[PDB]
Design a protein around this ligand. Sequence first.
Ligand SMILES: O=N[O-]
Ligand SMILES: O=N[O-]
Ligand SMILES: O=N[O-]
Ligand SMILES: [Cu+2]
Ligand SMILES: [Cu+2]
Ligand SMILES: [Cu+2]
Ligand SMILES: [Cu+2]
Ligand SMILES: [Cu+2]
Ligand SMILES: [Cu+2]
Lengths: 336, 336, 336
Amino acid sequence: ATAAEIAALPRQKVELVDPPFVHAHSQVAEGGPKVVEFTMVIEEKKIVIDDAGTEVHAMAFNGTVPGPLMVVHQDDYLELTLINPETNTLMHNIDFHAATGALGGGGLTEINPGEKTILRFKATKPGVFVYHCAPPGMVPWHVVSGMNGAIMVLPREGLHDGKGKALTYDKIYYVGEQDFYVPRDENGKYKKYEAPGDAYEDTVKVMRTLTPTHVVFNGAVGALTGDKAMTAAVGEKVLIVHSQANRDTRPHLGGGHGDYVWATGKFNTPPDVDQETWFIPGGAAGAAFYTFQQPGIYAYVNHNLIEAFELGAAAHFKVTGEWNDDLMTSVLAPSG
Amino acid sequence: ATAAEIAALPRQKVELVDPPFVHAHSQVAEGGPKVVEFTMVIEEKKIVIDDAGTEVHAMAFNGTVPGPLMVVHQDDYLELTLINPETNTLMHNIDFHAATGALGGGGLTEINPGEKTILRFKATKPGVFVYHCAPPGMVPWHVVSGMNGAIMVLPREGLHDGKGKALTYDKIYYVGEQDFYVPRDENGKYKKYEAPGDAYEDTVKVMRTLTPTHVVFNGAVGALTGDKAMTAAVGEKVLIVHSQANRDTRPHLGGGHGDYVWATGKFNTPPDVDQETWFIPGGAAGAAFYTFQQPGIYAYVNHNLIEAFELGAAAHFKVTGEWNDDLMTSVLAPSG
Amino acid sequence: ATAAEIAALPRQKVELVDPPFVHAHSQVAEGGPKVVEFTMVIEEKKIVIDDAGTEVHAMAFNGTVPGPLMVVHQDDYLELTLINPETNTLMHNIDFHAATGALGGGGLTEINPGEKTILRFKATKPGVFVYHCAPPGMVPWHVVSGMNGAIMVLPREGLHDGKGKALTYDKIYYVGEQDFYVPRDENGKYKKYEAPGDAYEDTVKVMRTLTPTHVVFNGAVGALTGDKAMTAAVGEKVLIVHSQANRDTRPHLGGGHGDYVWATGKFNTPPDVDQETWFIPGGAAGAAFYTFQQPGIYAYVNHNLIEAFELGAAAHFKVTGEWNDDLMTSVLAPSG
Ligand SMILES: O=N[O-]
Ligand SMILES: O=N[O-]
Ligand SMILES: O=N[O-]
Ligand SMILES: [Cu+2]
Ligand SMILES: [Cu+2]
Ligand SMILES: [Cu+2]
Ligand SMILES: [Cu+2]
Ligand SMILES: [Cu+2]
Ligand SMILES: [Cu+2]
């Protein structure tokens, strides 16, 4: 619309929350198009990714791996203030796969330590989309160092199934999956480095094998298990957004299904249904909607089970409620 | 349904057959919901997977790799009696991706050698689904030792295309694809062991490379070729169910196509059509429907040709009938 | 149709052009079914695939990697005269995934050096399809030496979206992606070989790692960049056909989207829409339609960013036109 119209749209600042949780939002849009404002500070920091104290110099949007999920509605504008503190050592930027132009905004947001930038783009396509850092010449290094996340652009009228019936979730979680490539010495021990740049050469060699040393959810092996398992109750409707900015994954809810899965992550593409295991290509986000029918622990995993159970890509859902013997029952328990 | 209502349902005992063949069943359901009974004994046994005499310590449902295809209709109940003989050395269980609750039944079917269990679940969603063993802490190991198969939950009214027209097959085959990780000694020779447990440590190291040493159909290189080639005739409609419990595959019928392909394996998701090569993610099963139009040998392969022709993922179809020159003809045969 | 009916159809000889360009054609078919004639000479030739000077003994249809795109309409007949010059040293053939019978024509086109053959087949199914050499016992070696390309079988009424609306492109490009497996010496430097056969054993060993040393577009790292970047203008509609005869890929247009993507490459399968990153399994071709909205440089990549930026799978689009600040704008340029 006109120049005045855009300038007159309401501006609204939103407080982000760390994954797997998601900031406050409404499924059906409230009011007309708005300029939704977010601010994220980039943090280069050492994080431990496994039970052996293995370290990675993470490059983290808002200080987390994955970066937080930003939620807007179709035709709203997302206006991000991106800050790169003087304490960091590298230049960073951001590419929103949801955006149109300049490498998703990457060409307009190259900021050195001590600089900030503000990017605005119109969210013209509904769906979940990956966002990731992409500095010319060092794109994969920043992405596999954890500098990626996703956003969700909801249809202004909320979600719907293939027949146009509304799909309203009770809660939503964002599972960011990260492939890491940590160098090892000749004895097989993971190496540690003083500064991010010190690990560059060694890391690229591991990257070229196309074989991650770790594949994790929310930044570490077991980050979404135990006391940090995601939760739900029988009867509750849950949307699970999943992203992988660099490598393929195949999510599976063990003991459950994806009732409606936008495998490509785009809401104008009708969702597949009754899915056992869906597929999200590297460089994309997907979303699955499920209504829980049984209480208990569910294993939510990348279904290359070696990646899930040897490399780290396994999360848990802890569900409360009444067991349904119609759906499943032990007719004869394990016995001699 | 109530326990009493379920108790009043008719029961039907099914006799399983070894892949790639499928037990007798009817495409369109005969009568109302029933409790379909199956029994499978678990057999830990050595299997030779290539012509170099390479061995794998298979953990096989019903004694085969893959385990047999079980066929029921939507809303029937599948009641499996699973037996772990005292001659085996490990605990095993079963997780049906088609089921709802307790890790697909895995949590209710953990049986030590000498024990048996009976699980019943309601087949509420139509499609082909993977089933696999998943002992806590030893999941990928059992799955990549061949302990997986699939089931098909047919719509009560049989198969239909995306427009509701019936699709009725003349023959059905089940191709289970398996990635194996066989340890090698310093001289590049595959190692042999006299106990499943003895190979654990060495196998986990190969599994972590995410690079299988073998990728085969029906448990071994050449298992579905030569004398075990699948058969059909021109004009015959064939359904090919394919599963891969741990790793991605991309089936292709050389010389033919997938006229209708439920790539996600779920019948409520309209099938793709006129497919050259489809994709099935690790942890899932898919199904392709084709009407043969030409006689001859067809190469059915995982289309990463290195996996098909160097690693073993290739099968054959031998088709009888009249050649169709309209569809294809050699105008000029190979000549100087 | 009968032999007589086919002999009565008009014939049109087409001159092929080198990828990423496509020979002249009409989107909507001109007239009734035709026998469209193509000729390709196979050339075993040395090609350099990177700036370091790495060599590959390519097996090239029409002298290029990928082989050229052949375009016909559904129900036309494709008649290919395939020539294997006496200067070559290996037997070759061709398997058209678009064809029905004899392994896509492979069983009828085995020609030794000094021979030629003419194969004709009816293009019964619409879509883009891979074609590749496949000599019994040496299949993957020929394919990963670059002996593959694609054809496009357009619907007689041109392309349409999933709801029947016509989709007419202004330009079309064919991006062939090739995984290469180049042997290295003890210093980690790529090896060169006098004759192609000399490289066989070393190459098969690399192939078995399932880890390509290079993944490139149009035969070489950076082949579609610089003066050879693809081009478009704001408002221009472009169809991008992409193929990978042996390995999966996940195309992404950086700064843009796939407005309509026939990810399976088959036109009778409704296209996905508003795609960020699509997926084409090894052994298939896919096609994406996009209307450019912003000027500037776009990175078209396989979105496993290691494969794109370390291995070579990255191309550029140079787009002329006016910047759209409504779609995207730098509110605050990088500043302190
Ligand atoms: O839920 N793991 O198969
Ligand atoms: O067309 N099968 O390689
Ligand atoms: O377009 N590279 O993320
Ligand atoms: Cu960065
Ligand atoms: Cu990207
Ligand atoms: Cu087991
Ligand atoms: Cu599973
Ligand atoms: Cu060849
Ligand atoms: Cu092929």
